[PDB]
Amino acid sequence: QEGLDFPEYDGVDRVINVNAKNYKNVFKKYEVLALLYHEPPEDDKASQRQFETEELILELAAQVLEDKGVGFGLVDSEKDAAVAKKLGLTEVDSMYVFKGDEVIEYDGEFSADTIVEFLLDVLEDPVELIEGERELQAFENIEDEIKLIGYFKSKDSEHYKAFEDAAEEFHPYIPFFATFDSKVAKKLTLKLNEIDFYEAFMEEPVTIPDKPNSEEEIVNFVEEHRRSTLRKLKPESMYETWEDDMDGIHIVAFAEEADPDGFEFLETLKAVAQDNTENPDLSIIWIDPDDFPLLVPYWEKTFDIDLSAPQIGVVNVTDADSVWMEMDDEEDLPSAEELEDWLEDVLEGEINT
C-alpha cells in the first residue's frame, strides 16, 4: 500500500461561496482560483443529490491541490449575478480558472480526476521548448490536437515573447512549442520567426503569414482556424466540443484506436479528413469509446448501435436522434471513396436525421 494511496476527502470545508463581499480576499488566498458558475439548485431533493455530490467533487480536488496553491469556489448565478458579471462568468455550469492575467473556461467532464488533471495542466508553463531529435520526434507524435511551433533565436527574442503571450491566450487547450535549435528548425522547414500551425490530424502545416508575428496576429490566426476538420472528443473539453454543433448536428465517428477494426476504420477516416480538409462545412467528432466507458451502454441504447464495432453517423443535438452508416459488421468497413460519398450525402442533406 505504501507509495500508492488515493486521497479520501477529510471533511474540511475548502470550497465556499464566492460573493461580492469575500471575492477580493479569496483571490489573494490562492495562486490559481477556479470558480464554478452555477444556477441555484432546484427545490426538489433529487436535484440536491446531484448538487451536493458535485460540490464534494470540487472538495476532493480542492484537498488534492491545496499544497499547489489552487483553490475552488462557487458563484451563484442569481445571488451573485453582480460579482459574476464583473469577473466574466457568463456560461452556467462552466468553471472559470484564474491564472495570472488570463481566465480559462473549463467545460468538460465533472470528475475529480479530470478536474485535477486539468488544473495540473493549467499550472504548467504555456510554452514547451524543443531541442534535439528525440524532443522533435515527441512534437511530431502529437496528432489529436491543434499544435503550433515557432523558430526563434532565444528566450529573449521579442518574437518569442509575443509567441508566449499568444500561448497564454489558449492555455492549456492548444500546445505551443518553440525551438532555438537550427537543426530542428531545418527539419520542420521553419525560417527564423516563422510559426507553423498544424490542424489536428493534418500532416501538412500552415505558416502564419506576415512574419514576424505579434501576439495579435497569432491570436487572430488561431481563432480563425480553431475548428479542425476532424476533432477527437476529450473528457477535459467534451461539453465545449459538443456544444459547438454544425447547424444542429454532429457527424460522430466511433472507433477504438487500439482495436484492429477500429484502427482500420480510423485510418480511412483520417485519410478522408485530410483529402477534404479545405471543405468549410465538414466537421467530424471522433469518439474513442474506451475514453468514455460510463457512456458506452447509454450510447448503444440511444443510438441503437454496437460500440464493439466502428460506427459513423449523424447525431441531432436537440433530441439525440441519429442515423448511422449501414455496415454488416466490423469487417464491412467503407472505403475512403464510400466514406466520402456518405459524407457528401450527409452534407447535402440527402442523409438526414
Q: Which is nearer to a copy of itself, 89 or 314 (CB)?
A: 314
Contact between 81 and 19 under an 8 Å Cβ cutoff? The reply is no
Point out which span in 35-43, 221-229, 255-263, 341-349 binds a copy of itself (CB under 8 A): 255-263
Q: What is the DSSP letter of 203?
A: S
DSSP symbols for 78-141: TTTHHHHHHHT--STT-EEEEETTEEEEE-S---HHHHHHHHHHHHS-SEEE--HHHHHHHHHH
Q: Does 318 bind a copy of itself (CB under 8 A)?
A: yes
Point out which span in 29-37, 151-159, 294-302, 338-346 binds a copy of itself (CB under 8 A): 294-302
From the CB of 142, what's the least distance to a copy of itself, in Å? 7
Q: What is the DSSP letter of 69?
A: T
Q: Does 319 bind a copy of itself (CB under 8 A)?
A: yes
Q: Which of 74, 75, 130, 253 binds a copy of itself (CB under 8 A)?
A: 130
Gyration radius from the chain CA atoms: 22
Instruction: Classify 14 as helix, strand or coil.
Output: coil
What part of residues 68-97 is at the interface with a copy of itself (CB under 8 A)?
A: 68
Q: Does 260 bind a copy of itself (CB under 8 A)?
A: yes
- Chain residues that interact with Ca ion, rule: CB under 5 A: 13, 15, 91, 107, 113, 121, 165, 172, 189, 210, 229, 239-240, 259-261, 264, 277, 290, 331
Distance between CA atoms of residues 262 and 353, nearest Å: 24
Q: Does 12 bind a copy of itself (CB under 8 A)?
A: no
Distance between CA atoms of residues 61 and 312, nearest Å: 36
Q: Does 139 bind a copy of itself (CB under 8 A)?
A: yes
Q: Does 264 bind a copy of itself (CB under 8 A)?
A: yes
Axis-axis angle for helices 112-123, 46-64 (nearest 10):
40
From the CB of 301, what's the least distance to Ca ion, in Å? 18
Q: Which residues contact 303 (CB under 8 A, 6 or more apart)?
A: 311, 313, 315, 320, 322, 324
Distance between CA atoms of residues 222 and 144, nearest Å: 16
Point out which span in 72-80, 123-131, 157-165, 196-204 binds a copy of itself (CB under 8 A): 123-131
Percent helix, strand, coil in the chain, to 5, is 40, 20, 40
Binding site partner of 26, from a copy of itself, Ca ion, none, Cβ cut-off 5-8 A by kind:
none
Binding footprint of a copy of itself on the chain (CB under 8 A): 2-9, 49-50, 60, 64-65, 67-68, 109-114, 116-117, 120, 124, 128-132, 134-135, 137-139, 141-142, 238-239, 242, 250, 252, 258-261, 263-264, 267, 290, 293-299, 301-303, 308, 315-320, 322, 331
